PDB file of all heavy atoms in Angstrom:
ATOM      1  N   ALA C  34     124.463 -82.780-164.002  1.00  0.00           N
ATOM      2  CA  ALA C  34     124.111 -82.289-165.325  1.00  0.00           C
ATOM      3  C   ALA C  34     125.364 -82.028-166.141  1.00  0.00           C
ATOM      4  O   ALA C  34     125.429 -82.344-167.329  1.00  0.00           O
ATOM      5  CB  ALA C  34     123.279 -81.020-165.203  1.00  0.00           C
ATOM      6  N   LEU C  35     126.377 -81.460-165.508  1.00  0.00           N
ATOM      7  CA  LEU C  35     127.616 -81.193-166.210  1.00  0.00           C
ATOM      8  C   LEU C  35     128.277 -82.487-166.627  1.00  0.00           C
ATOM      9  O   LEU C  35     128.829 -82.599-167.729  1.00  0.00           O
ATOM     10  CB  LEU C  35     128.546 -80.396-165.314  1.00  0.00           C
ATOM     11  CG  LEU C  35     128.318 -78.902-165.144  1.00  0.00           C
ATOM     12  CD1 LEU C  35     128.797 -78.169-166.341  1.00  0.00           C
ATOM     13  CD2 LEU C  35     126.869 -78.577-164.908  1.00  0.00           C
ATOM     14  N   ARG C  36     128.244 -83.470-165.739  1.00  0.00           N
ATOM     15  CA  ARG C  36     128.787 -84.778-166.061  1.00  0.00           C
ATOM     16  C   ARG C  36     128.065 -85.351-167.266  1.00  0.00           C
ATOM     17  O   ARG C  36     128.692 -85.897-168.186  1.00  0.00           O
ATOM     18  CB  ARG C  36     128.649 -85.699-164.854  1.00  0.00           C
ATOM     19  CG  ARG C  36     129.468 -86.962-164.880  1.00  0.00           C
ATOM     20  CD  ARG C  36     129.427 -87.630-163.522  1.00  0.00           C
ATOM     21  NE  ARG C  36     130.127 -86.847-162.515  1.00  0.00           N
ATOM     22  CZ  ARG C  36     131.428 -86.905-162.277  1.00  0.00           C
ATOM     23  NH1 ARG C  36     132.226 -87.719-162.951  1.00  0.00           N
ATOM     24  NH2 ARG C  36     131.933 -86.135-161.342  1.00  0.00           N
ATOM     25  N   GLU C  37     126.747 -85.167-167.307  1.00  0.00           N
ATOM     26  CA  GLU C  37     125.974 -85.617-168.452  1.00  0.00           C
ATOM     27  C   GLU C  37     126.395 -84.861-169.700  1.00  0.00           C
ATOM     28  O   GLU C  37     126.474 -85.441-170.788  1.00  0.00           O
ATOM     29  CB  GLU C  37     124.482 -85.432-168.190  1.00  0.00           C
ATOM     30  CG  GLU C  37     123.868 -86.457-167.271  1.00  0.00           C
ATOM     31  CD  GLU C  37     122.410 -86.165-166.977  1.00  0.00           C
ATOM     32  OE1 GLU C  37     121.865 -85.203-167.558  1.00  0.00           O
ATOM     33  OE2 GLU C  37     121.806 -86.900-166.169  1.00  0.00           O
ATOM     34  N   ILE C  38     126.692 -83.571-169.552  1.00  0.00           N
ATOM     35  CA  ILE C  38     127.064 -82.768-170.703  1.00  0.00           C
ATOM     36  C   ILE C  38     128.319 -83.329-171.324  1.00  0.00           C
ATOM     37  O   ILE C  38     128.383 -83.598-172.528  1.00  0.00           O
ATOM     38  CB  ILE C  38     127.259 -81.305-170.299  1.00  0.00           C
ATOM     39  CG1 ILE C  38     125.927 -80.681-170.021  1.00  0.00           C
ATOM     40  CG2 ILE C  38     127.924 -80.548-171.396  1.00  0.00           C
ATOM     41  CD1 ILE C  38     126.009 -79.461-169.226  1.00  0.00           C
ATOM     42  N   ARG C  39     129.332 -83.519-170.503  1.00  0.00           N
ATOM     43  CA  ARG C  39     130.597 -83.970-171.040  1.00  0.00           C
ATOM     44  C   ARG C  39     130.466 -85.370-171.606  1.00  0.00           C
ATOM     45  O   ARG C  39     131.009 -85.660-172.681  1.00  0.00           O
ATOM     46  CB  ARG C  39     131.674 -83.889-169.978  1.00  0.00           C
ATOM     47  CG  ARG C  39     132.101 -82.468-169.741  1.00  0.00           C
ATOM     48  CD  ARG C  39     133.211 -82.311-168.721  1.00  0.00           C
ATOM     49  NE  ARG C  39     133.242 -80.934-168.236  1.00  0.00           N
ATOM     50  CZ  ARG C  39     132.738 -80.502-167.084  1.00  0.00           C
ATOM     51  NH1 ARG C  39     132.155 -81.319-166.215  1.00  0.00           N
ATOM     52  NH2 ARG C  39     132.827 -79.216-166.792  1.00  0.00           N
ATOM     53  N   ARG C  40     129.679 -86.228-170.953  1.00  0.00           N
ATOM     54  CA  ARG C  40     129.554 -87.592-171.453  1.00  0.00           C
ATOM     55  C   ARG C  40     128.858 -87.604-172.807  1.00  0.00           C
ATOM     56  O   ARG C  40     129.328 -88.253-173.749  1.00  0.00           O
ATOM     57  CB  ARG C  40     128.811 -88.493-170.463  1.00  0.00           C
ATOM     58  CG  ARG C  40     128.725 -89.954-170.946  1.00  0.00           C
ATOM     59  CD  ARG C  40     127.914 -90.895-170.082  1.00  0.00           C
ATOM     60  NE  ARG C  40     126.722 -90.304-169.476  1.00  0.00           N
ATOM     61  CZ  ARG C  40     126.602 -89.936-168.203  1.00  0.00           C
ATOM     62  NH1 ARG C  40     127.593 -90.069-167.333  1.00  0.00           N
ATOM     63  NH2 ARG C  40     125.459 -89.422-167.790  1.00  0.00           N
ATOM     64  N   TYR C  41     127.740 -86.890-172.937  1.00  0.00           N
ATOM     65  CA  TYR C  41     126.982 -86.980-174.175  1.00  0.00           C
ATOM     66  C   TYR C  41     127.606 -86.167-175.289  1.00  0.00           C
ATOM     67  O   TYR C  41     127.364 -86.466-176.460  1.00  0.00           O
ATOM     68  CB  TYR C  41     125.538 -86.551-173.957  1.00  0.00           C
ATOM     69  CG  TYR C  41     124.759 -87.487-173.076  1.00  0.00           C
ATOM     70  CD1 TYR C  41     124.256 -87.066-171.868  1.00  0.00           C
ATOM     71  CD2 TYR C  41     124.523 -88.790-173.457  1.00  0.00           C
ATOM     72  CE1 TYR C  41     123.555 -87.910-171.058  1.00  0.00           C
ATOM     73  CE2 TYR C  41     123.822 -89.647-172.649  1.00  0.00           C
ATOM     74  CZ  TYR C  41     123.339 -89.198-171.452  1.00  0.00           C
ATOM     75  OH  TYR C  41     122.634 -90.039-170.636  1.00  0.00           O
ATOM     76  N   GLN C  42     128.430 -85.184-174.962  1.00  0.00           N
ATOM     77  CA  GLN C  42     129.114 -84.442-175.993  1.00  0.00           C
ATOM     78  C   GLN C  42     130.385 -85.122-176.452  1.00  0.00           C
ATOM     79  O   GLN C  42     130.856 -84.834-177.553  1.00  0.00           O
ATOM     80  CB  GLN C  42     129.421 -83.051-175.495  1.00  0.00           C
ATOM     81  CG  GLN C  42     128.221 -82.204-175.427  1.00  0.00           C
ATOM     82  CD  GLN C  42     128.522 -80.797-175.032  1.00  0.00           C
ATOM     83  OE1 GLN C  42     129.506 -80.525-174.359  1.00  0.00           O
ATOM     84  NE2 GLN C  42     127.676 -79.884-175.452  1.00  0.00           N
TER      85      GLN C  42
END
Side-chain angles (χ1 to χ4, degrees):
Chain C
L35 282 283
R36 195 169 292 274
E37 283 176 4
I38 287 161
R39 285 182 199 101
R40 183 185 37 256
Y41 293 117
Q42 287 184 334

